[PDB]
Amino acid sequence: KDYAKLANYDESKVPQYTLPSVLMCHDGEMVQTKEQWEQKRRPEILNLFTTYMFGKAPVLKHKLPCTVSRINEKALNGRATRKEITIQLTDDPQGPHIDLQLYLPNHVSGKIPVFLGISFMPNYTIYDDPDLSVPSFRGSMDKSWQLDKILEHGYGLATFCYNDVDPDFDDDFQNGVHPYYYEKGQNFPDPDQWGSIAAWAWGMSRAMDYLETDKKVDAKKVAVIGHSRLGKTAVWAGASDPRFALVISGNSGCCGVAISRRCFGETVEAMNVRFPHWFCGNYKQFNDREKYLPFDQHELVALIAPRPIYIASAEEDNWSDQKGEFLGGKGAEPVYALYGLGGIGCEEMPPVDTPYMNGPIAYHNRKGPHAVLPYDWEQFLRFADKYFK
Amino acid sequence: RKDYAKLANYDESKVPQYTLPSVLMCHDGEMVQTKEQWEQKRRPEILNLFTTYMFGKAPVLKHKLPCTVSRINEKALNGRATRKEITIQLTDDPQGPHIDLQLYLPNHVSGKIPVFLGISFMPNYTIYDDPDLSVSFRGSMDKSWQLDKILEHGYGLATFCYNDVDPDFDDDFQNGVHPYYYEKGQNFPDPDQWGSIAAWAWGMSRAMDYLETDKKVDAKKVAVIGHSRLGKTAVWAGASDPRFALVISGNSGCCGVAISRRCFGETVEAMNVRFPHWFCGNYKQFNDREKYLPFDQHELVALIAPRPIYIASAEEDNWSDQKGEFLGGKGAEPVYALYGLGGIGCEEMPPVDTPYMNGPIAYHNRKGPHAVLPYDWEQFLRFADKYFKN
Ligand SMILES: O=C(O)[C@H]1O[C@H](O)[C@H](O)[C@@H](O)[C@@H]1O
Ligand SMILES: O=C(O)[C@H]1O[C@H](O)[C@H](O)[C@@H](O)[C@@H]1O
Ligand SMILES: [Cl-]
Numbered sequence: 083k084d085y086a087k088l089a090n091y092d093e094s095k096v097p098q099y100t101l102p103s104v105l106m107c108h109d110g111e112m113v114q115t116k117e118q119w120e121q122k123r124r125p126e127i128l129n130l131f132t133t134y135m136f137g138k139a140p141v142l143k144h145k146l147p148c149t150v151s152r153i154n155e156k157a158l159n160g161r162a163t164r165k166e167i168t169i170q171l172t173d174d175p176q177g178p179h180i181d182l183q184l185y186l187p188n189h190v191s192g193k194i195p196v197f198l199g200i201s202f203m204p205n206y207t208i209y210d211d212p213d214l215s216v217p218s219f220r221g222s223m224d225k226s227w228q229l230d231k232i233l234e235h236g237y238g239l240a241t242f243c244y245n246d247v248d249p250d251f252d253d254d255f256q257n258g259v260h261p262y263y264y265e266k267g268q269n270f271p272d273p274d275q276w277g278s279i280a281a282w283a284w285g286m287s288r289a290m291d292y293l294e295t296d297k298k299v300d301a302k303k304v305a306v307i308g309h310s311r312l313g314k315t316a317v318w319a320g321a322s323d324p325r326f327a328l329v330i331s332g333n334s335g336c337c338g339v340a341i342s343r344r345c346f347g348e349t350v351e352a353m354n355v356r357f358p359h360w361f362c363g364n365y366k367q368f369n370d371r372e373k374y375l376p377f378d379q380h381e382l383v384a385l386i387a388p389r390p391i392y393i394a395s396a397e398e399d400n401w402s403d404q405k406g407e408f409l410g411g412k413g414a415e416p417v418y419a420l421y422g423l424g425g426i427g428c429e430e431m432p433p434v435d436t437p438y439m440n441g442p443i444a445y446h447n448r449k450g451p452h453a454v455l456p457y458d459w460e461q462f463l464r465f466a467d468k469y470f471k
Numbered sequence: 472r473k474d475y476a477k478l479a480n481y482d483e484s485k486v487p488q489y490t491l492p493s494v495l496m497c498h499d500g501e502m503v504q505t506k507e508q509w510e511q512k513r514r515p516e517i518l519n520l521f522t523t524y525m526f527g528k529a530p531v532l533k534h535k536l537p538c539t540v541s542r543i544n545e546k547a548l549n550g551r552a553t554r555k556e557i558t559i560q561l562t563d564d565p566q567g568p569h570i571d572l573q574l575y576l577p578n579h580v581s582g583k584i585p586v587f588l589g590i591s592f593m594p595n596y597t598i599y600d601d602p603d604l605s606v607s608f609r610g611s612m613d614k615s616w617q618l619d620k621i622l623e624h625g626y627g628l629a630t631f632c633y634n635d636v637d638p639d640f641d642d643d644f645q646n647g648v649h650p651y652y653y654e655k656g657q658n659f660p661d662p663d664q665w666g667s668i669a670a671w672a673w674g675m676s677r678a679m680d681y682l683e684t685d686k687k688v689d690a691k692k693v694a695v696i697g698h699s700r701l702g703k704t705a706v707w708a709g710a711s712d713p714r715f716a717l718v719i720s721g722n723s724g725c726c727g728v729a730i731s732r733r734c735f736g737e738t739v740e741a742m743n744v745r746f747p748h749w750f751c752g753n754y755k756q757f758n759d760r761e762k763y764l765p766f767d768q769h770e771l772v773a774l775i776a777p778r779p780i781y782i783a784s785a786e787e788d789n790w791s792d793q794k795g796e797f798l799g800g801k802g803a804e805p806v807y808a809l810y811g812l813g814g815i816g817c818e819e820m821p822p823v824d825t826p827y828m829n830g831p832i833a834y835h836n837r838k839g840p841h842a843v844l845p846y847d848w849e850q851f852l853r854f855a856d857k858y859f860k861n
């Protein structure tokens with residue numbers, strides 16, 4: 083079945099919908115204080131997303147082993163320190179691990195704020211760093227990481243390849259991390275248990291377990307960032323792991339920050355049928371049934387509150403539903419207001435190349451294609467400066 | 472809306488290879504060898520799976536609902552029967568939905584009386600051509616209920632129309648009992664809460680709550696029976712309410728007793744797309760994903776063990792998957808064995824008009840159309856006699 087021919091790109095044809103009320107508890111009590119949000123409502127909304135969309139991840143009692151496998155304090159011609167960190171994902175030392183690559187700027191005062199990116203490609207793609215070689219070449223993804231801009235801001239960048247945690251293909255979860263956490267008599271995750279995206283976002287929490295033990299890293303200023311499917315991951319990492327200080331959604335779109343009820347471009351059915359491994363088994367009940375979601379994506383952004391989040395759209399990325407991305411941001415504003423924080427700063431989706439970033443929810447829709455571009459990183463750094471300086 | 476009946480496989484050679492989820496294997500890998508392990512560990516796991524992922528949780532009451540005996544005719548059918556109408560209030564609202572239960576008990580019978588509790592497609596007047604009732608038309612469904620045959624066996628019949636509990640149409644659960652059991656911040660069942668079949672089945676449990684207070688009824692000898700969507704319902708009533716002594720599945724088929732993984736005739740997707748109100752939210756995840764079901768329908772029959780179940784198929788009803796219905800029964804035999812009970816008594820699906828009812832699981836596949844006919848009732852009463860008499 084082709085989902086591209088079924089996509090609506092006509093704003094006039096978007097159906098009627100009502101967002102589920104972010105401030106009304108299941109039992110009817112209206113949240114009017116941050117105390118009511120923190121102690122009652124937020125727990126209900128986290129449980130819905132964990133059970134019905136992303137799936138439960140293993141809850142570890144103790145950290146998994148990490149070893150620093152190589153440091154170069156003089157990387158990039160002395161400008162940076164590069165560390166390679168191996169992060170076990172199981173209590174078997176021959177089981178899957180993350181190869182974490184961390185760049186810290188040399189000669190800045192104070193602990194270093196770090197962007198924890200998750201990447202489509204191996205760590206050697208992040209920068210033409212001559213101390214690395216490639217057995218899809220060295221520095222190939224420089225453009226979507228902008229290491230030089232990050233260093234110039236006094237910030238670090240830690241990345242790993244998501245294929246370390248779970249290969250991005252539908253194999254009935256017999257590769258990657260999943261089979262290590264099955265019970266005896268279990269060949270498959272329960273309907274409420276992690277798919278690929280929850281595994282990747284859990285990966286980012288194992289990366290954070292390392293980063294908070296790093297002397298030069300400010301563990302209170304670790305941002306999470308990803309593009310597209312790794313944008314959906316970064317928002318879930320941010321929502322599920324409140325240690326992260328700032329969330330960057332790069333074109334996260336459908337089942338990221340975009341309102342599902344709009345059914346614009348990609349839909350829940352297009353997503354779950356083309357990528358059956360991404361979300362938990364339970365999520366497949368919402369195929370063609372966005373009406374019956376017990377949440378929408380504005381409540382996922384609400385889980386970030388009061389921490390900042392940057393929503394980035396691309397003007398050509400109609401599949402992502404740029405307007406629905408903005409509206410996922412807008413729908414979270416009532417929760418930020420509990421903390422006496424303002425909103426995006428406008429009522430209508432703003433024009434192209436016009437960032438709003440003076441509130442705790444930042445948004446821009448930029449010219450050109452589905453990507454992370456230098457222009458995006460310009461805006462993310464400017465936003466991050468407001469919190470990290 | 473795709474015409475699924477056009478697209479369905481009814482060719483036995485094209486049934487996919489599949490493995491049935493093991494009924495005896497607990498989630499943690501422990502195998503059941505004893506009835507004690509079944510009752511204490513495994514049965515509860517399976518019941519929770521079906522309640523969470525297929526039918527949905529129903530309200531649990533702290534007290535029996537209000538009811539009144541509205542009418543009593545101790546001289547019904549020219550003195551052959553006592554007829555009572557019992558109005559059962561399903562909610563806190565007395566202007567809300569009620570079960571209007573009709574109970575026929577044979578006169579001239581001494582003991583407490585065994586009772587078939589049926590759920591019907593149509594109102595009480597359709598059950599029998601009873602001359603003291605008024606308007607399809609009076610006794611239009613007589614052939615599906617055979618009250619004369621039930622009374623002849625010294626058994627009684629209790630029925631109510633399923634529309635009484637929840638209307639059978641997709642109105643987003645804003646009518647029937649559903650909206651009365653919403654929290655103040657809720658406009659729709661949670662994904663793990665009852666759809667229509669679980670409400671209908673809960674309706675039968677409220678009927679049983681009245682029946683057990685009626686001094687003429689033998690509360691230990693109440694059979695549940697339904698046909699097609701009400702067969703699905705009767706099997707769930709029997710699995711979820713252990714008070715029922717005997718379960719009759721009339722052509723219950725897909726998401727009834729038939730094996731889902733055969734993907735033969737009706738499929739999970741055809742079911743949930745055409746009848747989105749029937750099963751809970753969660754069950755929609757299994758649309759075209761039968762291999763990912765954490766169970767199959769042999770485990771639902773297993774929830775009746777050790778109590779008897781009659782599985783009835785029709786020769787023309789290929790939509791229901793008659794061999795799948797046979798194999799659901801076959802698949803539960805390992806659980807009945809823990810109780811030292813036989814199986815159906817044949818290994819492969821028997822030919823038409825060939826009943827097997829010497830085990831705790833009975834089966835026939837009768838000639839003719841999707842229905843309940845006098846033939847079926849003849850077999851059902853012969854089976855009931857084995858348990859309700861000596
Ligand atoms: O990860 C990506 O690049 C994108 O892949 C597909 O286009 C998918 O439908 C999108 O949801 C996703 O954002
Ligand atoms: O209730 C009935 O008569 C039947 O109606 C339809 O055929 C439905 O698809 C069947 O599953 C059901 O058993
Ligand atoms: Cl809606």
Ligand SMILES: [Cl-]
Nearest residue numbers: 138139140275
């Ligand atoms: Cl888990």
Ligand SMILES: [Cl-]
Nearest residue numbers: 171172177178
């Ligand atoms: Cl490991």
Ligand SMILES: [Cl-]
Nearest residue numbers: 361362363364
């Ligand atoms: Cl799944």
Ligand SMILES: [Cl-]
Nearest residue numbers: 591592593612
């Ligand atoms: Cl009927």
Ligand SMILES: [Cl-]
Nearest residue numbers: 595596598599
């Ligand atoms: Cl009648």
Ligand SMILES: [Cl-]
Nearest residue numbers: 812813830831
């Ligand atoms: Cl026996």
